[PDB]
């Protein structure tokens, strides 16, 4: 059924790190193994992007663009001046120079990665008018990313993505709990949060903000500085983009490309309480989510905000209702999968009973055939037709 040869590129969310980080414990595979290696082993050429887990989708897309084709990250002169961080970031050799020669990729994105992938597609195709106009008005140079006209992306697949935000950000103790989540992923990787490791271990890639863990600093201490830093206090952050208002703002400009396939997977790991209408964690959900996040997600309503009952089912971290595609402030279409994947529309591939971390293998779930999950997805992506023609 193989109808294209595009390689697959994997993209994490508000947690995530390179293949060499976390002592080789993989974000994509966790305690289950190495998802990229499984795909490559099965004949599906697969790569992995690592970008700032806490950075805005904008920053991450700029980082992803430079990580793909090579070069020094360029966040755009207008954006950098706007938010007060460096215009230029780290330099990359480029994972896929074939992209500079018409090649295309499939992106498989988990969590906030889904937002980033969508945004990258948009900047690639449309560029940024704001940047272009700023470059002409200030006589500054312009990254090719902002010119538009790039078509690197044949498909985007999002898994557990908060396309409409997650109400988790609304928790009153969200900042302290969000970083506890980072601590919980570290723990999953068997990494302590109260130890000043001399090796990097987990690089948050805050080059633009000039933030990095210092010698003698544990992750606990590091996170306490991050909490008070601009990567947590600004609107140019994952924290803002993850929020319902922030995701809506994102949706208002980040539209689905008619040249690109979109697949969404929804995840859920909760049950409904008959008398309260709330949703509750099941048995099997990662311990941190079950205790600290799922109860809030499954009970938080806010009429002002648009959060009614539909939002309560969740995967421990993200409202399921947010996952099938952008809706809030979005002109994108979403169709249930009907056997045939269509261009320029969100193909809701269905809802899977796995939690936010289980779906990438970071939390165990031996009832979830994760190997089969990604293999079946790879097959589906490789079957996507470059072209279509009307028929009866
Ligand atoms: Ca589990
Ligand atoms: Zn930025």
Please, what are the domains in the chain?
Answer: 1-392 (3.40.50.1820)
Question: Among the options 315, 322, 330, 355, which is catalytic?
Answer: 315
Judging by DSSP bridges, how do beta strands 71-74 and 88-92 pair with one another? antiparallel
User: In 3D, which of 334, 386, 380, 348 has the Cα closest to residue 8?
Assistant: 380
User: In 3D, which of 124, 387, 377, 123 has the Cα closest to residue 263?
Assistant: 377
d(CA 19, CA 189): 13
12 included as an active-site residue: no
d(CA 142, CA 215): 36
User: CA dist 311 to 157, 272, 299, 322, 337, Å?
Assistant: 22, 12, 9, 8, 22
356 included as an active-site residue: yes
Quick one: which ligand is closest to 208's CA?
2
Question: Among the options 12, 83, 163, 356, which is catalytic?
Answer: 356
d(CA 135, CA 131): 6
110 included as an active-site residue: no
User: In 3D, which of 300, 262, 74, 82 has the Cα closest to residue 158?
Assistant: 262
Structural biology method used: X-ray
Mark the binding-site residues, compressed into ranges: 59, 79, 85, 236, 284, 358, 363-364
User: In 3D, which of 100, 106, 108, 110 has the Cα closest to residue 13?
Assistant: 110
Cα 335 to ligand 2 centre (Å):
33
Residue that the structure tokens 């079957």 belong to: 383
Cα 140 to ligand 1 centre (Å):
50
* Cβ < 5 A residues, ion ligand 2: 56, 59, 236
Cα 322 to ligand 1 centre (Å):
21
């Amino acid at each position: 059924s193989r109808a294209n040869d595009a390689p697959i590129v994997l993209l994490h969310g508000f947690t995530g790190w390179g293949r060499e980080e976390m002592f080789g414990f993989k974000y994509w595979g966790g305690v289950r193994g190495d998802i990229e290696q499984w795909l490559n082993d099965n004949g599906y050429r697969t790569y992995t992007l690592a970008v700032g887990p806490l950075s805005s989708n904008w920053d991450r897309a700029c980082e992803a663009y430079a990580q793909l084709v090579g070069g020094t990250v360029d966040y755009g002169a207008a954006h950098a001046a706007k938010h007060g961080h460096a215009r230029f970031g780290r330099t990359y050799p480029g994972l896929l120079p074939e992209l500079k020669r018409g090649g295309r990729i499939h992106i498989i994105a988990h969590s906030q990665g889904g937002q980033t992938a969508r945004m990258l597609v948009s900047l690639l195709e449309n560029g940024s008018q704001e940047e272009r106009e700023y470059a002409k008005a200030h006589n500054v140079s312009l990254s090719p990313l902002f010119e538009g006209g790039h078509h690197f992306v044949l498909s985007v697949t999002t898994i557990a993505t908060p396309h409409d935000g997650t109400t988790l950000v609304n928790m009153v103790d969200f900042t302290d709990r969000f970083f506890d989540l980072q601590k919980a992923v570290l723990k999953a990787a068997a990494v302590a949060s109260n130890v000043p490791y001399t090796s990097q271990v987990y690089d948050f890639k805050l080059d633009q903000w000039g933030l990095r863990r210092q010698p003698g600093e544990s992750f606990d201490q590091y996170f306490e500085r991050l909490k008070r830093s601009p990567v947590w206090t600004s609107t140019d952050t994952a924290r803002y983009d993850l929020s319902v208002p922030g995701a809506e703002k994102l949706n208002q400009w980040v539209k689905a490309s008619p040249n690109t396939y979109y697949l969404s997977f929804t995840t859920e790991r909760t049950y409904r309480g008959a008398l309260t209408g709330n949703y509750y964690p099941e048995l099997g959900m990662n311990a941190f989510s079950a205790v600290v996040c799922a109860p809030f997600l499954g009970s938080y309503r806010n009429a002002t905000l648009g959060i009614d009952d539909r939002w309560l089912e969740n995967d421990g971290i993200v409202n399921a209702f947010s996952m099938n595609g952008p809706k809030r402030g979005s002109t994108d279409r979403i169709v249930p999968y009907d056997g045939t994947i269509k261009k320029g529309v969100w193909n809701d591939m269905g809802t899977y009973n796995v939690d936010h971390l289980e779906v990438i293998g970071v939390d165990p779930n031996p009832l979830f055939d994760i190997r089969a999950f990604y293999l079946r997805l790879a097959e589906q992506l490789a079957s996507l037709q470059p072209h279509h023609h009307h028929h009866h």
